[PDB]
Design brief:
With about 230 residues, this protein is an all-beta fold. It is about 0% helix and about 50% strand. It has 2 domains: about 5-115, Sandwich (Immunoglobulin-like), CATH 2.60.40.10; about 125-220, Immunoglobulin-like (Sandwich), CATH 2.60.40.10. It has no helices and 24 strands. The chain starts with a strand and ends with a strand. One chloride ion binds near residues 124, 125, 128, 222 and 223.
Protein backbone atom coordinates (compact mmCIF):
# COMPACT_ATOMS: atom_id res chain seq x y z
CA UNK A 1 0.00 0.00 0.00
CA UNK A 2 1.17 3.50 -0.92
CA UNK A 3 2.53 5.50 2.01
CA UNK A 4 4.22 8.84 2.69
CA UNK A 5 5.98 8.43 6.06
CA UNK A 6 7.03 11.57 7.98
CA UNK A 7 8.55 11.87 11.56
CA UNK A 8 6.09 13.08 14.26
CA UNK A 9 7.94 16.14 15.73
CA UNK A 10 11.07 18.22 15.54
CA UNK A 11 12.01 20.50 18.46
CA UNK A 12 14.36 23.19 17.14
CA UNK A 13 16.03 26.49 18.17
CA UNK A 14 15.47 29.90 16.45
CA UNK A 15 18.14 30.48 13.82
CA UNK A 16 18.77 26.74 13.17
CA UNK A 17 17.90 24.75 10.01
CA UNK A 18 15.83 21.57 10.04
CA UNK A 19 15.48 18.85 7.39
CA UNK A 20 12.09 17.15 7.16
CA UNK A 21 11.83 13.75 5.44
CA UNK A 22 9.03 12.06 3.53
CA UNK A 23 9.88 8.33 3.00
CA UNK A 24 7.67 6.98 0.19
CA UNK A 25 6.69 3.40 -0.57
CA UNK A 26 4.17 1.40 -2.50
CA UNK A 27 4.57 3.22 -5.88
CA UNK A 28 7.29 4.58 -8.24
CA UNK A 29 8.72 7.63 -6.43
CA UNK A 30 10.42 9.14 -9.46
CA UNK A 31 7.19 9.26 -11.44
CA UNK A 32 4.87 11.50 -9.29
CA UNK A 33 5.21 15.12 -8.19
CA UNK A 34 5.30 15.56 -4.36
CA UNK A 35 4.06 18.75 -2.75
CA UNK A 36 4.71 20.25 0.74
CA UNK A 37 2.02 22.12 2.70
CA UNK A 38 2.22 24.19 5.91
CA UNK A 39 -0.65 24.07 8.40
CA UNK A 40 -1.37 26.67 11.12
CA UNK A 41 -4.54 27.35 13.22
CA UNK A 42 -4.94 30.93 11.88
CA UNK A 43 -3.90 30.58 8.22
CA UNK A 44 -5.18 27.09 7.46
CA UNK A 45 -3.11 25.38 4.77
CA UNK A 46 -0.39 26.98 2.64
CA UNK A 47 1.20 25.44 -0.46
CA UNK A 48 4.99 25.61 -0.08
CA UNK A 49 6.15 24.06 -3.32
CA UNK A 50 6.58 20.84 -5.24
CA UNK A 51 9.33 18.58 -6.62
CA UNK A 52 9.30 16.07 -9.47
CA UNK A 53 11.58 13.34 -8.00
CA UNK A 54 12.46 11.77 -11.38
CA UNK A 55 14.73 14.74 -12.25
CA UNK A 56 14.67 17.01 -9.16
CA UNK A 57 12.83 19.90 -10.85
CA UNK A 58 11.27 22.21 -8.19
CA UNK A 59 8.59 24.95 -8.08
CA UNK A 60 8.15 27.19 -5.03
CA UNK A 61 5.43 29.48 -3.79
CA UNK A 62 7.06 32.94 -3.99
CA UNK A 63 6.48 33.36 -0.27
CA UNK A 64 8.57 30.31 0.64
CA UNK A 65 11.36 30.66 -1.95
CA UNK A 66 14.06 31.49 0.62
CA UNK A 67 12.62 29.58 3.57
CA UNK A 68 12.30 26.15 1.91
CA UNK A 69 14.59 23.92 -0.23
CA UNK A 70 13.12 20.73 -1.71
CA UNK A 71 15.35 17.79 -2.66
CA UNK A 72 14.74 14.12 -3.55
CA UNK A 73 16.83 11.00 -3.07
CA UNK A 74 15.90 8.30 -5.57
CA UNK A 75 18.15 5.71 -3.92
CA UNK A 76 16.06 5.80 -0.73
CA UNK A 77 12.73 6.88 -2.30
CA UNK A 78 12.72 9.88 0.15
CA UNK A 79 11.91 13.58 -0.42
CA UNK A 80 13.24 16.21 1.93
CA UNK A 81 12.39 19.79 2.74
CA UNK A 82 14.93 21.95 4.46
CA UNK A 83 13.65 24.92 6.44
CA UNK A 84 16.34 27.52 7.10
CA UNK A 85 16.70 30.51 9.47
CA UNK A 86 13.93 29.18 11.71
CA UNK A 87 11.77 31.73 13.56
CA UNK A 88 8.58 31.43 15.67
CA UNK A 89 6.64 32.01 12.44
CA UNK A 90 7.85 28.56 11.24
CA UNK A 91 6.20 26.63 14.12
CA UNK A 92 3.57 24.62 12.25
CA UNK A 93 2.68 21.18 10.93
CA UNK A 94 4.25 20.35 7.52
CA UNK A 95 2.79 17.61 5.28
CA UNK A 96 4.10 16.00 2.09
CA UNK A 97 1.35 14.88 -0.33
CA UNK A 98 0.33 14.07 -3.87
CA UNK A 99 -2.16 16.89 -4.37
CA UNK A 100 -3.71 16.17 -7.70
CA UNK A 101 -7.08 14.72 -6.80
CA UNK A 102 -6.73 11.56 -8.87
CA UNK A 103 -3.45 10.66 -7.04
CA UNK A 104 -4.50 12.02 -3.58
CA UNK A 105 -2.15 10.75 -0.88
CA UNK A 106 -0.96 12.53 2.32
CA UNK A 107 1.70 11.96 4.86
CA UNK A 108 0.69 12.34 8.53
CA UNK A 109 2.68 15.61 8.89
CA UNK A 110 5.73 16.65 10.98
CA UNK A 111 5.11 19.18 13.74
CA UNK A 112 8.04 21.61 13.79
CA UNK A 113 8.22 23.48 17.10
CA UNK A 114 10.60 26.45 17.15
CA UNK A 115 11.23 26.78 20.85
CA UNK A 116 12.98 29.48 22.92
CA UNK A 117 11.67 30.41 26.38
CA UNK A 118 11.33 33.99 27.68
CA UNK A 119 -3.08 38.29 -7.06
CA UNK A 120 -2.97 34.85 -5.47
CA UNK A 121 -6.51 33.47 -5.28
CA UNK A 122 -7.80 33.94 -1.71
CA UNK A 123 -10.26 31.35 -0.36
CA UNK A 124 -12.57 32.36 2.49
CA UNK A 125 -14.53 29.75 4.45
CA UNK A 126 -17.64 30.60 6.44
CA UNK A 127 -18.19 29.69 9.22
CA UNK A 128 -14.73 28.88 10.53
CA UNK A 129 -16.24 26.72 13.29
CA UNK A 130 -19.57 25.16 14.02
CA UNK A 131 -21.24 22.56 16.22
CA UNK A 132 -24.12 20.52 14.77
CA UNK A 133 -26.37 17.98 16.51
CA UNK A 134 -26.34 14.35 15.52
CA UNK A 135 -28.56 13.82 12.50
CA UNK A 136 -28.73 17.54 11.63
CA UNK A 137 -27.14 19.40 8.67
CA UNK A 138 -23.79 21.17 8.40
CA UNK A 139 -23.35 23.67 5.53
CA UNK A 140 -20.01 25.38 4.87
CA UNK A 141 -19.25 28.07 2.31
CA UNK A 142 -16.01 28.63 0.40
CA UNK A 143 -15.65 31.78 -1.67
CA UNK A 144 -12.79 32.55 -4.04
CA UNK A 145 -11.40 36.00 -4.88
CA UNK A 146 -11.31 35.05 -8.62
CA UNK A 147 -12.97 32.32 -10.74
CA UNK A 148 -11.51 28.84 -10.29
CA UNK A 149 -13.26 27.41 -13.32
CA UNK A 150 -11.81 26.32 -16.68
CA UNK A 151 -13.78 24.89 -19.55
CA UNK A 152 -16.90 24.27 -17.44
CA UNK A 153 -14.96 22.40 -14.66
CA UNK A 154 -14.26 23.89 -11.18
CA UNK A 155 -10.64 23.41 -10.10
CA UNK A 156 -11.59 23.28 -6.46
CA UNK A 157 -11.57 20.42 -3.97
CA UNK A 158 -12.54 19.89 -0.34
CA UNK A 159 -10.32 18.03 2.14
CA UNK A 160 -11.32 16.55 5.50
CA UNK A 161 -8.95 16.11 8.39
CA UNK A 162 -10.39 13.98 11.21
CA UNK A 163 -8.79 14.36 14.69
CA UNK A 164 -5.40 12.70 14.81
CA UNK A 165 -5.62 11.53 11.15
CA UNK A 166 -3.91 12.95 7.98
CA UNK A 167 -6.02 15.18 5.64
CA UNK A 168 -7.71 13.28 2.82
CA UNK A 169 -9.63 14.27 -0.28
CA UNK A 170 -13.35 14.47 0.33
CA UNK A 171 -14.84 16.07 -2.83
CA UNK A 172 -13.05 16.89 -6.09
CA UNK A 173 -13.90 19.40 -8.81
CA UNK A 174 -16.64 21.05 -6.69
CA UNK A 175 -19.18 18.26 -6.68
CA UNK A 176 -17.64 14.75 -7.07
CA UNK A 177 -17.38 12.45 -4.03
CA UNK A 178 -13.98 10.78 -3.76
CA UNK A 179 -14.07 6.92 -3.66
CA UNK A 180 -15.09 5.60 -0.27
CA UNK A 181 -16.69 8.91 0.87
CA UNK A 182 -20.30 8.41 2.12
CA UNK A 183 -23.38 9.77 0.39
CA UNK A 184 -24.19 12.11 3.30
CA UNK A 185 -21.57 14.53 1.92
CA UNK A 186 -22.30 16.68 -1.12
CA UNK A 187 -20.68 19.65 -2.81
CA UNK A 188 -22.05 22.35 -5.10
CA UNK A 189 -20.92 25.61 -6.67
CA UNK A 190 -19.14 27.12 -9.66
CA UNK A 191 -17.15 30.22 -10.50
CA UNK A 192 -16.22 31.82 -7.14
CA UNK A 193 -18.91 30.32 -4.80
CA UNK A 194 -18.90 26.74 -3.47
CA UNK A 195 -20.79 24.95 -0.63
CA UNK A 196 -20.15 21.72 1.29
CA UNK A 197 -23.19 19.96 2.80
CA UNK A 198 -23.23 17.08 5.26
CA UNK A 199 -26.58 15.56 6.28
CA UNK A 200 -27.34 13.70 8.44
CA UNK A 201 -24.16 14.45 10.42
CA UNK A 202 -22.67 11.53 12.36
CA UNK A 203 -19.96 11.49 15.05
CA UNK A 204 -17.36 10.34 12.58
CA UNK A 205 -17.92 13.63 10.67
CA UNK A 206 -16.21 15.75 13.35
CA UNK A 207 -13.17 17.11 11.50
CA UNK A 208 -11.60 20.23 10.03
CA UNK A 209 -12.67 20.87 6.43
CA UNK A 210 -10.50 22.84 3.95
CA UNK A 211 -11.32 24.01 0.41
CA UNK A 212 -8.50 24.29 -2.11
CA UNK A 213 -8.19 25.74 -5.61
CA UNK A 214 -5.78 24.51 -8.27
CA UNK A 215 -6.88 26.65 -11.22
CA UNK A 216 -3.98 29.11 -10.89
CA UNK A 217 -0.52 28.96 -9.28
CA UNK A 218 0.15 29.00 -6.48
CA UNK A 219 -2.42 26.49 -5.25
CA UNK A 220 -4.25 28.05 -2.30
CA UNK A 221 -6.46 26.73 0.54
CA UNK A 222 -9.12 28.23 2.85
CA UNK A 223 -8.35 28.74 6.54
CA UNK A 224 -10.42 25.66 7.48
CA UNK A 225 -13.72 25.06 9.26
CA UNK A 226 -13.78 22.97 12.44
CA UNK A 227 -16.94 20.93 12.77
CA UNK A 228 -17.81 19.42 16.18
CA UNK A 229 -20.87 17.42 17.35
CA UNK A 230 -23.33 19.36 19.58
CA UNK A 231 -24.08 16.92 22.43
CL1 LIG B 1 -17.86 33.32 9.32
CL1 LIG C 1 -10.96 31.13 5.72
NA1 LIG D 1 10.32 3.27 -3.87
NA1 LIG E 1 -20.29 34.35 6.14
Amino acid sequence: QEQLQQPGTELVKPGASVRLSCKTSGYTFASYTLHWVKQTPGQGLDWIGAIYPGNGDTSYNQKFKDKATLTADKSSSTAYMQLSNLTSEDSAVYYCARLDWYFDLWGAGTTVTVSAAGSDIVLTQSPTSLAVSLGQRATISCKASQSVDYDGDSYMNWYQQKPGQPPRLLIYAASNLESGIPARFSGSGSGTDFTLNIHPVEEEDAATYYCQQNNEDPRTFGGGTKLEIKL
